[PDB]
Design a protein around this ligand. Structure first.
Ligand SMILES: *CCC(=O)N(c1cc(C(C)(C)C)on1)[C@@H](C(=O)Nc1ccc(OC)cc1C)c1cccnc1
Ligand SMILES: *CCC(=O)N(c1cc(C(C)(C)C)on1)[C@@H](C(=O)Nc1ccc(OC)cc1C)c1cccnc1
Lengths: 304, 304
């Protein structure tokens, strides 16, 4: 037992981290097969960030201007192209450590692991969630750009995020591995305010199920509710609306614990209305929303 | 910016995880050089757990009774010995993925990363702290025994913990890599209650410094205190006493933020006495104590 904010083991992704330098800017790149993926803003200088014309800035760059270093050895760049907000640098050597992989674009509410890197070197790994406003609450300093988000299913790494920027509010924005930003963010130093960071209701319910499985049952009550009644309360507290799809996704957890999904919704409703009263659930004094129902099942069953 | 419960990248430790089977029990082992380390309770059956005589149980085991599998290939066991509560199985092949390593016995309050494994396969990584009562609040299911705790300094892995058991209260006990348990716990299925889980004061202060560095400053007040006054309050709230050694360890964070350690203690004192009032610090509604002052500096500086 015990429930922890757990990340996927990062080895498979560590073997893919490289350093990409263009001029004076150095950031992280992801080396899969003979391609290195990195944020296109690696070609930008001090001025450029404010109003960059990437197509124009890219004309002044040749293959030899992109310095790619994997460990302490240099990779030869034989081609370069821009796909949306990522640069793809074709190298002459396939990464011998390329795991089986996919590029996926996740939905908000979905969780993933981030391997935070600096100068192509991994510094740490943590578990994130794509917020409903398409930001991520990460831990990224200057030079962390190019660090990636991923999920692993046995031996296949599904890359879903690449770090590009920090908004003035200390939250983070990035793209999928096709270079498309999550949300409305752009890779320029301009006024970009995030929308309402609503709570991922289905994840809170999944984590309440994890708490019951682990023995924290004080919040379980004698009440039930309906999806419509629950959602009136959820709207009031800036919680995402709960749909029949979410109820279905929670089915295995409801089955394992014997607590009907709507009964857990009524417990969540009373927690929203009354607060925790100084109590904790799974060692937390707030309702945790960065565990999906899949994460709860995986962690509670020991999927390797 | 942003502050996350960050683990060390786990690749170097993933390359060391093996499966050890003795009879019907299968748990995890750590393969460094030509030795595989695992909990000695791998030799125990259903009955044995209650009152095991490990020296007697070990007499009935030969090298061929220990099945060690690294990936899908079997390792040949050429020697076996018991060192305290760990078994050391000498194999005929040195692990080609052995990183530079050390075995360290950490103090309570110190943090570390755990790579939770099942059948020698890594399932997840998370950051822990050795509690002042010598337990760890992990996430471990049956078969997780032999999973290890570690810290990394650039390229050297310092292994500090090996998982052995879960106490009836859902908390975890284990040993260092020399087989010595942390705390008074023993590897037998008996009444073993944990002591008071006090809060690691120096870690809470380090995390309050991390919050100031990241912009969460609402809790900063106009007060100061002394080590003796602060400690009277700390004792009342089951916080560990703060010593001059802890104040010295917080020096770099005090220097970076310009907030004297005793001033941060007075802020912590008011948080203990008044509570959070429904507010959060670094996205948490309670005072976090699983970040050491070294972790705060490492994360805030991007040590790779
Ligand atoms: C690796 C790049 C980097 O450190 N950062 C960055 C990103 C960019 C552009 C060209 C805008 C994509 O330029 N520098 C920064 C970052 O995003 N800083 C930043 C913060 C706030 C604002 O407000 C307008 C603009 C910018 C540029 C970074 C720092 C920490 C974490 N991630 C990224
Ligand atoms: C990998 C071994 C295992 O799953 N567990 C275990 C440990 C042991 C001994 C021989 C006692 C060291 O036997 N089985 C269990 C575990 O420790 N279970 C457990 C819980 C509570 C009590 O109370 C008396 C006794 C025992 C044996 C395990 C389960 C989950 C996480 N870690 C370990």
């Amino acid at each position: 037992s015990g429930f922890r904010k757990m990340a996927f083991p990062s080895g498979k992704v560590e073997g893919c981290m490289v350093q990409v330098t263009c001029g004076t800017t150095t950031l992280n790149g992801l080396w899969l097969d003979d391609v290195v993926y990195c944020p296109r803003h690696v070609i930008c200088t001090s001025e450029d960030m404010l109003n960059p014309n990437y197509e124009d800035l890219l004309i002044r760059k040749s293959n030899h201007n992109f310095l790619v270093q994997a460990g302490n050895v240099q990779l030869r760049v034989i081609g370069h192209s821009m796909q949306n907000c990522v640069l793809k640098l074709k190298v002459d050597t396939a990464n011998p450590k390329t795991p089986k992989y996919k590029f996926v674009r996740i939905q908000p509410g979905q969780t993933f692991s981030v391997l935070a890197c600096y100068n192509g070197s991994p510094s740490g790994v943590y578990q994130c969630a794509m917020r409903p406003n398409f930001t991520i609450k990460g831990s990224f300093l200057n030079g962390s750009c190019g660090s990636v988000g991923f999920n692993i299913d046995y031996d296949c790494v599904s890359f879903c995020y690449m770090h590009h920027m920090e908004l003035p509010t200390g939250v983070h924005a990035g793209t999928d591995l096709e270079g498309n930003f999550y949300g409305p963010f752009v890779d320029r130093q301009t006024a970009q305010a995030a929308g309402t960071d609503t709570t991922i209701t289905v994840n809170v319910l999944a984590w309440l199920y994890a708490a019951v499985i682990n023995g924290d049952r004080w919040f379980l009550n004698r009440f039930t509710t309906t999806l419509n009644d629950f959602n009136l309360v959820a709207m009031k507290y800036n919680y995402e609306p709960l749909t029949q799809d979410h109820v279905d996704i929670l089915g295995p957890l409801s089955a394992q614990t014997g607590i009907a999904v709507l009964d857990m919704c009524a417990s969540l409703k009373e927690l929203l209305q009354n607060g925790m009263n100084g109590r904790t659930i799974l060692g937390s004094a707030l309702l945790e929303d960065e565990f999906t129902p899949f994460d709860v099942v995986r962690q509670c069953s020991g999927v390797t």
